[PDB]
Structures are given as C-alpha cells and as structure tokens.
Amino acid sequence: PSCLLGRVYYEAKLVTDDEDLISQCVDESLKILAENINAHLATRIHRRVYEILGVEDPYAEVKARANEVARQVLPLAKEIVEGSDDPFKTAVIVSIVGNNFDYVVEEEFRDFLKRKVQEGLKINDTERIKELSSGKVVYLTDNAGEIFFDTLLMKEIKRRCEKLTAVVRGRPIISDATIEDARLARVDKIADELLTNGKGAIGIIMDELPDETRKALEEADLIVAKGMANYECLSLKPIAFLLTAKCEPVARDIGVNVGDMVAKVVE
C-alpha cells in the first residue's frame, strides 16, 4: 500500500511534470486506498492513474531497456543452462533472477548468475515441476526483460510437454510483459499458443480472462506462474510459483526469508 503510493508518484513523474496531474494521481489513489495490496486494487489504482495522465504505457522506455539488456546477455544465460549438470533447474533459476541483474555488463552478469546458481533455491521443487511438464502447460509471465529469460525455461519445458501456452498482459500495466514483449522474445515461436489475461490486470482477475485463456488455465496439467503478484492471486492446481521473495509479506506467506529464491509447487 505504501510502496504502491510511491509507485504512483514515480509513474506520474515518468509521464509528466504538471503538478496538478501528479497530485491528482496521488490524491485519487489515496481515496481508493482509504475506501478499500490486492491485485484488483492495484489494478484499479494504476488504471485510474493512467487515465488521469492520458497515457497508455508510462514504463515503455523502462521496459525497453530491460528487454535490451536481456537480449544482450541471454546467449550467456543459455551457456550456463546448457553447461550445467541440471539444465532444467538452472533454467528455473535463470527465469527467476535474470532480470534482477543491476546495470561490459556481459562479464558482470556472468558473475551475478553464477553466484545466484551457487546460492540455489531455498524451496526447490524443480524435479516435480519437470515431472508435471509432460502435460498441457500454461506459462504465466510477469515482467518485460524477464520474459527473455523465461524463454529458456520454455524451451526446457518444450522438450517434454503435450502443449505450451504462454500468457501475457492484454494491455500495458506497470512493467508487465505484453504480447509485443513476447514477440520480441520469440515466445510466439516457442509456445504453441500465446494468449492474454484480457484487459491487462496485475496478477490474474478471473472475471477479465478471455474465454480461450480461461479454458487453457482450467485444462492445464501444470501452471507456471512468475513473480509475486501471480502468486498472491493464485494461492487452479497444480501450480508452480517461481519468484524471489522481495517483501516480508510474501516471504512470510510462502515460508522463506526475504531475498530467497523459490520454485514452489502447490500440487
């Protein structure tokens, strides 16, 4: 709730300098927080803020830079997957941490990723994930940049599965990957189907799903869900949550410490 409000201020400042608009964003956000952070609430708040700002994608540039760095280093990430003793687990780790990397940069990322692999998963259900990947799999993405790293795990999954369906956001909201991000990363060449969550909610809002996507989720033999908002919406089974616990609330919910990497299957 606090972070959200800071994030509203940040977004507004990405778009505009009009203090009237910026304060209108923050003030209208305060009003909504006071009346009712949930996925439905954060979504409702960002949408209202974008409406006040008259913007479609305030994070357009910030997402592009994440895509750019991901593109630069992905061949190296592949090297580490292909070269590891357990490619599937290493692909999981890469999908979780690749976009956590801090801004040549190619050498630094090699160190970062090798360090995260040494630390490993605090919760490591990757063998079970691998097992369940033989069925119809739905891969629910999170951010731009990150979606480039997700392609590595999709290829691994693609070795076993009956079918792979990727889901992205139907409209830009914060740094979430949209269908264009998925095309940049060539998700449409790897996955058998590429779908949206509808009007582009943070997390999943069942009411907003297109019928094709809802069906794919219900019929899935495994859902792979990236990040915190997805976890908080979907805790539909079996589901694997791949994420870093970046906050106390999420960490306590999952049963790890902050900063821990998680690949958790709720069977």
**Contact between 55 and its own copies per CB under 8 A:** yes
Two structure tokens written together for 145? 């940049």
CB atoms within 10 A of CB 99: 23
Residue 232 interacts with which of its own copies, Cl ion, none, CB < 5 to 8 Å by class: none
Of the two residues 45 and 167, which places its CB atom closer to Cl ion in the complex?
A: 45
Q: Which amino acid would we find at residue 210?
A: P
Give min distance, CB of 243 to its own copies, in A.
Answer: 23
**Contact between 48 and Cl ion per CB under 5 A:** yes
**Contact between 15 and its own copies per CB under 8 A:** yes
Give min distance, CB of 251 to its own copies, in A.
Answer: 31
Give min distance, CB of 68 to its own copies, in A.
Answer: 5
Using the 8-state DSSP alphabet, how is residue 175 labeled?
Answer: T
Of the two residues 48 and 128, which places its CB atom closer to Cl ion in the complex?
A: 48
Are the C-beta atoms of residues 197 and 167 closer than 8 Å to each other? yes
Give min distance, CB of 19 to its own copies, in A.
Answer: 10
Axis crossing angle, helix 87-97 with helix 105-119, rounded to the nearest 10: 120
Give min distance, CB of 70 to its own copies, in A.
Answer: 8
In whole angstroms, give the CA distance from residue 180 to residue 19. Answer: 32
Of the two residues 43 and 126, which places its CB atom closer to Cl ion in the complex?
A: 43
Are the C-beta atoms of residues 110 and 76 closer than 8 Å to each other? yes
Residues with Cβ within 8 Å of 94's Cβ and at least 6 positions away in sequence, in order, are 77, 80, 81, 113, 149, 152, 153
**Contact between 123 and its own copies per CB under 8 A:** no
Residues within the interface to its own copies (CB under 8 A): 14-16, 18, 21, 51, 53-58, 60-61, 63-68, 70-71, 171-172, 178, 180-181, 184
